[PDB]
């Protein structure tokens, strides 16, 4: 259905949150990868709000501790996924209308993500 | 009708008959029997002598009998007196250090120019020729271009500020002896053919 739109739109919000943490805790954030189905569109149309698909929070020593990814514009089983490297931690987040962003049935609030990122920072970061 | 009798004649004398699954026929005659056999071929009713294509196999990946090879094309026009339409090729190898060949200019005048070209492009001198004079390449040009040990002789491409290209160092395409940019080339880049 049309929920698709808000998904990518919601994705941008997510990035803001991520960006915020870098400005908050003074730790390096990086745009990892943009959308290939946006680079290789030559004349074809592209309506999505952003072209950035993957980003991460890297410590001083460069190894990321938090990874976030989104399904491409034409891929099936569209979702957003999260991962903690070295910690075997993965999340499958969807967006349920009216409620908000939900990990299954549990809404994903900004506070939840912020606490998760801080736990990762204290645990996995080397320097 | 005459092509079948050509095959029956040559196979009876033990000359190899080359055939690809595409519909073109090669008949390789040795040097001695070449002149007399092809004279008999013209007598067999071959009006038209289309091509004289000279070949240098110096850099061919698989080895071949001899380096140079001259191929004539004998045809009988379908719309002329009694035209079957029989067209075929005659290949005759010429050694690297023996660039000889008797001409069929006396039979077809078409070998006047054509053989000269093969003498111009390759080191092959045609015996019995009225005039073996360089046709295409400049009169002061030294050598025979189309043989692989003869350079193509390229010039670099030019750009703004010291930025140049040497195309022979720029080519990503592979020849037959080029191993490739990886350890090797196998599979579909060593030869690929669809099965209709």
């Amino acid at each position: 259905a049309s929920s698709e739109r808000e998904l990518y739109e919601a994705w941008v919000e997510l990035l803001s949150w991520m960006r915020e943490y870098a400005q908050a805790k003074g730790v390096r954030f990086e745009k990892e990868a943009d959308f290939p189905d946006f680079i290789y569109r030559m004349e074809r149309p592209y309506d999505l709000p952003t072209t950035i698909m993957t980003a991460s929070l890297s410590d001083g020593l460069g190894e990321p501790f938090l990874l976030a990814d989104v399904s491409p514009r034409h891929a099936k089983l569209k979702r957003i996924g999260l991962r903690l490297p070295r910690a075997h931690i993965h999340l499958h987040a969807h967006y349920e209308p009216g409620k908000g962003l939900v990990t299954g049935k549990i809404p994903l609030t900004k506070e939840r993500f912020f606490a998760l990122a801080d736990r990762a920072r204290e645990a996995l970061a080397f320097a | 009708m005459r092509l079948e009798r050509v095959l029956e004649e040559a196979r009876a004398k033990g000359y190899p008959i080359e055939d690809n699954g595409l519909g073109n026929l090669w008949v390789v005659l040795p040097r001695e029997r070449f002149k007399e056999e092809m004279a008999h071929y013209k007598a067999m009713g071959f009006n038209f002598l289309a091509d004289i294509v000279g070949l240098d196999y110096l850099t061919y990946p698989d080895p071949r009998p001899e380096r140079f090879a001259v191929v004539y094309e004998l045809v009988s026009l379908p719309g002329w007196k009694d035209g079957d339409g029989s067209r075929f090729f005659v290949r005759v190898y010429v050694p690297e250090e023996d660039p000889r060949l008797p001409t069929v200019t006396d039979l077809w005048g078409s070998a006047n120019f054509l053989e000269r070209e093969v003498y111009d492009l390759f080191g092959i001198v045609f015996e019995g020729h009225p005039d073996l004079r360089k046709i295409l390449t400049p009169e002061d040009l030294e050598g025979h271009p189309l043989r692989k040990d003869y350079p193509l002789g390229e010039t670099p491409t030019l750009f703004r500020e010291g930025r140049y290209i040497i195309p022979a160092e720029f080519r990503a395409a592979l020849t037959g002896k080029d191993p490739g940019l990886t350890f090797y080339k196998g599979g579909s880049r060593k030869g690929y053919r669809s099965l209709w």
Binding site: F38, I39, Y40, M42, E43 | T157, L158, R160, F170
Partner: protein, 180 residues
Amino acid sequence: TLKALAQSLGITLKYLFSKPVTVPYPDAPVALKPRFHGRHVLTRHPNGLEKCIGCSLCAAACPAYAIYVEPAENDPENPVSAGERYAKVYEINMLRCIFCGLCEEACPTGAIVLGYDFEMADYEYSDLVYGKEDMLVDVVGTKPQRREAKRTGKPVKVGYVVPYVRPELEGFKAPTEGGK
């Protein structure tokens, strides 16, 4: 066959009274097809980011080898291309270029696409190497045309008209058949 002289005379006269057929360049705009092979243009995405990712697929498939591409790595703050790679130096020697469409055909990002300018006559070999900033879609006119408009103070008018510009030329602004 004396009649043939008279018939020839008569038809030549009939054409004499038939005035029209010709087109007077430069006074009349040359009618070009939308698929015409002209000066290359580098196209940009809606984001403004440039489409060229500096991959040198245009240069290898060039039968004259006239295309030069030095790459570089994007600056995350102010990126130039979409990926991690852009074209620092993009030169095409129009005296080597033979106008195939092989660089257009092989460009995966749709950046390099032929335009419509043919009015690129110049005096010097060294000046006929058209660069990156000499072909962008934003630019309106050829090198001698822009130099003449600058040393003349009079704006550029291209001497061609097309029924429409292709979708591959998104952003290519040109005179279209008289719509303006």
